[PDB]
Ligand binder design. Structure first.
Ligand SMILES: CO[C@H]1/C=C/O[C@@]2(C)Oc3c(C)c(O)c4c(c3C2=O)C(=O)C=C(NC(=O)/C(C)=C\C=C/[C@H](C)[C@H](O)[C@@H](C)[C@@H](O)[C@@H](C)[C@H](OC(C)=O)[C@@H]1C)C4=O
Length: 275
C-alpha cells in the first residue's frame, strides 16, 4: 500500500502538472512559420530526422497544411527551425513552471535549481510530448497544431531507427497513467549526476523517494501479468532518455554553430552566453 506521505508526493506532482501543462496548447501563440565542410554533412544528417508535416486547424474551421521540401543540398533544410524553436521555448517555459511549483524543488538552492533544469528540460519536454503522441497515426496532437510523420522508406520500421522516434513509440506502448508520467518527470528532474549540482546527496535522496513511490504505485494498481517488470521497464526508458538527451544536445550545438536559431531562453538553458 501507498503510505500517506507517498500519496502526498503524487498529489503535489499531479497538482504541479495540472497547473503547468497546457494540454490544448491554447496559449501557444505568435509562433513563426515556414516562408510562403564536413560540418554541413553532419548538420544535414542531424536535421534529416525532421520529415514532419504540420497542420493548423483554424478556430473558424479552416485548415492550413504544410508539406516540407525535399533535401536538395541547400538551405531548405532550415525551414522549420524557427517554428520548432518557438514550440520548444513554449514547452521549456511550461517545464520551468512545473518545477517551481514543486516544494521539493523550491527548497533546493537556486544554483542547483538551475543546474537541474538545464539538465532535464529536454527530457521533461519529451515526456509531456509523449502524452499527446498518437502512435497509430504517428502524430503529435498539440491542440490546434498537429505534427505528422511523413512516409520515408521501410514504412515505420526504418523510422524507428531514429532513437528519439523509437523512444516515443516504446514509451507509448507501456500505456502509462498520468501519475506514472509525472513521477518519471520527477525522477528525471531530480537527477543528482547533472553537471554543476552541489547538493548531490539531497537530490539523490529525493530521487530515490520518487522512484520508490513510483515502484509502490505500480505494485498497488497494476497486478496484471502484462505489467510485470513495468517499474524496471520505466527506469530503462529514463536511462535511454538521458542518452537521447546527450545525443540531442550535441546535434543542437552543431546546428547553432552553423545556423543560429536558438531563442534567448534556449540559449540560457544550453549555456550560450551571447558573446
Ligand atoms: C529542443 O529540441 C527542439 C529544438 C531543436 O532545435 C533543432 C535545431 O535541433 C534539432 C535536433 C537536434 C533534432 O534532432 C531534430 C530537430 C531539431 C531542431 O529544429 C527537428 O527540428 C526535428 C526533428 N525530428 C522530428 O521532426 C521528429 C522526430 C518529430 C516531429 C515532431 C515532434 C512534435 C517533436 O519531435 C517534439 C516531440 C520535440 O522533440 C521537438 C519540438 C523538440 O523540442 C523539444 C522541446 O524537445 C525540438 C527538436 C529532429 O530530430
Amino acid at each position: 500500500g501507498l503510505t500517506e506521505e507517498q500519496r502526498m508526493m503524487i498529489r503535489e506532482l499531479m497538482d504541479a502538472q495540472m497547473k503547468t501543462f497546457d494540454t490544448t496548447f491554447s496559449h501557444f501563440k505568435n509562433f513563426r512559420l515556414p516562408g510562403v565542410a564536413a560540418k554541413w554533412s553532419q548538420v544535414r544528417k542531424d536535421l534529416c530526422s525532421l520529415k514532419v508535416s504540420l497542420q493548423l486547424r483554424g478556430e473558424d474551421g479552416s485548415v492550413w497544411n504544410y508539406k516540407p521540401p525535399a533535401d536538395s543540398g541547400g538551405k531548405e533544410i532550415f525551414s522549420l527551425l524557427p517554428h520548432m524553436a518557438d514550440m520548444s521555448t513554449y514547452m521549456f517555459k511550461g517545464i520551468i513552471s512545473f518545477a517551481k511549483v514543486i516544494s521539493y524543488f523550491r527548497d533546493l538552492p537556486i544554483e542547483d535549481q538551475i543546474s537541474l533544469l538545464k539538465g532535464a528540460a529536454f527530457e521533461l519536454c519529451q515526456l509531456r510530448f509523449n502524452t499527446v503522441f498518437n502512435a497509430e497515426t504517428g502524430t503529435w496532437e498539440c491542440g490546434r497544431l498537429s505534427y505528422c510523420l511523413e512516409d520515408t522508406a521501410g514504412g515505420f520500421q526504418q523510422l524507428l531507427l531514429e532513437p528519439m522516434l523509437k523512444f516515443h513509440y516504446m514509451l507509448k506502448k507501456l500505456q502509462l497513467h498520468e501519475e506514472e508520467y509525472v513521477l518519471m518527470q520527477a525522477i528525471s528532474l531530480f537527477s543528482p549526476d547533472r553537471p554543476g549540482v552541489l547538493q548531490h546527496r539531497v537530490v539523490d535522496q529525493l530521487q530515490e523517494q520518487f522512484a520508490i513511490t513510483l515502484k509502490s504505485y505500480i505494485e498497488c494498481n497494476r497486478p496484471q501479468p502484462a505489467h510485470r517488470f513495468l517499474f524496471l521497464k520505466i527506469m530503462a526508458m529514463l536511462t535511454e532518455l538521458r542518452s537521447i538527451n546527450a545525443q540531442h544536445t550535441q546535434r543542437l550545438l552543431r546546428i547553432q554553430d552553423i545556423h543560429p536559431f536558438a531563442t534567448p531562453l534556449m540559449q540560457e538553458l544550453f549555456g550560450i552566453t551571447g558573446s
